[PDB]
């Protein structure tokens, strides 16, 4: 999307291997807030919004 009409996708009812995301070094930066990217694989969430 354009930022003007920015796109939200809700992610739900699924298993998320965030280690695969964090290890994909095509991603130039991966800052995180309230959580460290290491611990994402140990947590569980009531909703996720991308």
């Amino acid at each position: 999307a354009s930022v003007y009409a920015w796109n939200r996708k809700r992610i739900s009812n699924c298993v998320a291997d965030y280690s695969v995301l964090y290890n994909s070094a095509s991603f130039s930066t991966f800052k995180c807030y309230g959580v460290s990217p290491t611990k994402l694989n140990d947590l569980c969430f009531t909703n996720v919004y991308a």
């Binding site: 309230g34 959580v35 460290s36 611990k39 947590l43």
Partner: protein, 49 residues
């Protein structure tokens, strides 16, 4: 109502201890009042702050 002093001495301690307990719920500018949240959510370098 006659034993006002003795009942007050118990009440003052109950207020003090319940304040000391309730202060565990205070954030003090941390991410959570519950220590296990921080330790499950963060790497040590961030958790120490």
């Amino acid at each position: 109502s006659a034993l006002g002093k003795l009942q007050d001495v118990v009440n003052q301690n109950a207020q003090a201890l319940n304040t000391l307990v309730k202060q565990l719920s205070s954030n003090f500018g941390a991410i959570s009042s519950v220590l296990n949240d921080i330790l499950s959510r963060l790497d040590k370098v961030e958790a120490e702050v």
